[PDB]
Design an enzyme around this catalytic site. Sequence first.
Site, PDB file in Angstrom:
ATOM      1  CG  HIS A   1     -52.784 -30.499  -0.173  1.00  0.00           C
ATOM      2  ND1 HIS A   1     -51.707 -30.160   0.645  1.00  0.00           N
ATOM      3  CD2 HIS A   1     -53.404 -31.410   0.272  1.00  0.00           C
ATOM      4  CE1 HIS A   1     -51.614 -30.950   1.750  1.00  0.00           C
ATOM      5  NE2 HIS A   1     -52.808 -31.819   1.500  1.00  0.00           N
ATOM      6  CD  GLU A   2     -57.226 -32.144  -0.299  1.00  0.00           C
ATOM      7  OE1 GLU A   2     -56.756 -33.291   0.000  1.00  0.00           O
ATOM      8  OE2 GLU A   2     -57.237 -31.392   0.367  1.00  0.00           O
TER       9      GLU A   2
ATOM     10  CG  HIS B   1     -52.991 -36.214  -0.910  1.00  0.00           C
ATOM     11  ND1 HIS B   1     -51.907 -36.491  -0.068  1.00  0.00           N
ATOM     12  CD2 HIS B   1     -53.643 -35.123  -0.186  1.00  0.00           C
ATOM     13  CE1 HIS B   1     -52.071 -35.457   0.803  1.00  0.00           C
ATOM     14  NE2 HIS B   1     -53.064 -35.030   1.081  1.00  0.00           N
TER      15      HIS B   1
ATOM     16  CE1 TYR C   1     -51.763 -37.652   4.451  1.00  0.00           C
ATOM     17  CE2 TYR C   1     -53.421 -38.320   6.129  1.00  0.00           C
ATOM     18  CZ  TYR C   1     -52.786 -37.325   5.344  1.00  0.00           C
ATOM     19  OH  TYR C   1     -53.296 -35.918   5.278  1.00  0.00           O
TER      20      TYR C   1
ATOM     21  CD  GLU D   1     -51.146 -33.560   4.168  1.00  0.00           C
ATOM     22  OE1 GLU D   1     -51.281 -32.298   4.307  1.00  0.00           O
ATOM     23  OE2 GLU D   1     -51.922 -34.186   3.756  1.00  0.00           O
TER      24      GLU D   1
ATOM     25  CG  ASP E   1     -52.149 -34.531  11.727  1.00  0.00           C
ATOM     26  OD1 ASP E   1     -53.037 -34.920  10.911  1.00  0.00           O
ATOM     27  OD2 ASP E   1     -51.204 -33.790  11.716  1.00  0.00           O
TER      28      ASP E   1
ATOM     29  CG  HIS F   1     -52.250 -32.403   8.291  1.00  0.00           C
ATOM     30  ND1 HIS F   1     -52.922 -33.580   8.434  1.00  0.00           N
ATOM     31  CD2 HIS F   1     -52.762 -32.240   7.025  1.00  0.00           C
ATOM     32  CE1 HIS F   1     -53.794 -33.960   7.456  1.00  0.00           C
ATOM     33  NE2 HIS F   1     -53.819 -33.173   6.646  1.00  0.00           N
TER      34      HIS F   1
HETATM   35 ZN   LIG Z   1     -53.142 -33.512   2.380  1.00  0.00          ZN
END
Ligand SMILES: [Zn+2]
EC number: 3.4.24.27
Length: 316
Positions: free
Chosen positions: A142-143, A146, A157, A166, A226, A231
């Site tokens: 996931h990271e 990005h 974002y 996301e 958020d 998310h």
């Molecule tokens: Zn993320």
Amino acid sequence: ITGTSTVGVGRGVLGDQKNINTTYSTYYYLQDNTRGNGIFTYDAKYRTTLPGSLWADADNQFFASYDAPAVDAHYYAGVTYDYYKNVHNRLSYDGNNAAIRSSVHYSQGYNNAFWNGSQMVYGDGDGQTFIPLSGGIDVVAHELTHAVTDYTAGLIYQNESGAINEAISDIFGTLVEFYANKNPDWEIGEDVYTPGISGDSLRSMSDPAKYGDPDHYSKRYTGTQDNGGVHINSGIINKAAYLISQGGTHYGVSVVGIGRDKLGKIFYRALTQYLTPTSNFSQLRAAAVQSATDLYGSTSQEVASVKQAFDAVGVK
Ligand SMILES: [Zn+2]
Ligand SMILES: [Ca+2]
Ligand SMILES: [Ca+2]
Ligand SMILES: [Ca+2]
Ligand SMILES: [Ca+2]
């Protein structure tokens, strides 16, 4: 960092034994020279200064409990690199074999991991909500995803763009989890979340509403928390991606699944060719449709299933 490539052994966060690529030069460092310009793993030593110290070990054996997050960050970054290279013909996150850097033991009790624009960062968790976040292959991928997004579409974002950002990270993190065949599922963070509680996860792609995330555009979050729900509203896209791959009927709309490989190909094409920094959900639909059209033709099942999936989640 100049030295001899070798192979060490350690144990990850979940106690599993793995071989890791190291570099020897007086010490053995967590520096994998076999992939691109290298994968480097650093010790942040419970501080927030980054990246910290390149991880040095005296004997090339990483069985100490302090070592576990480093072993997993280092190993799972390699797996993610492999996925992108082997499946999508992409050399690292920038397409030109950029070095991948990760820091573990970030801060104290830190219940998060992130890509900061330069490198990945992993907290150890507080031991109740999370254990060290690099223990989850879906989290690591996931990271790293990005970083891919940053060098391609560049999705801002915030708001819908950020929710896409996301979702893309959840989609590819899941796809990497399946590629490594590490007890794969359509849940996010299950391996590192709430060690006291079985069967849960941070987010669900198969059923986002299980944890109160929306699974339809009519249920999207429109406030400011958020970053405008990046998310939270990702769940709408996650459900669509899950539908594209696995099929199902959702709010009365039936989707024939076309499987994970095609899902990946469609979304990767969408990400790298059609999405832009300000893309909204409606534009993501157009991009995914166009991508499936490119790959499979406009009268394909693949195109039909993409359309059905976005209709199922209420994205026009
Ligand atoms: Zn993320
Ligand atoms: Ca050692
Ligand atoms: Ca899993
Ligand atoms: Ca998972
Ligand atoms: Ca749990």
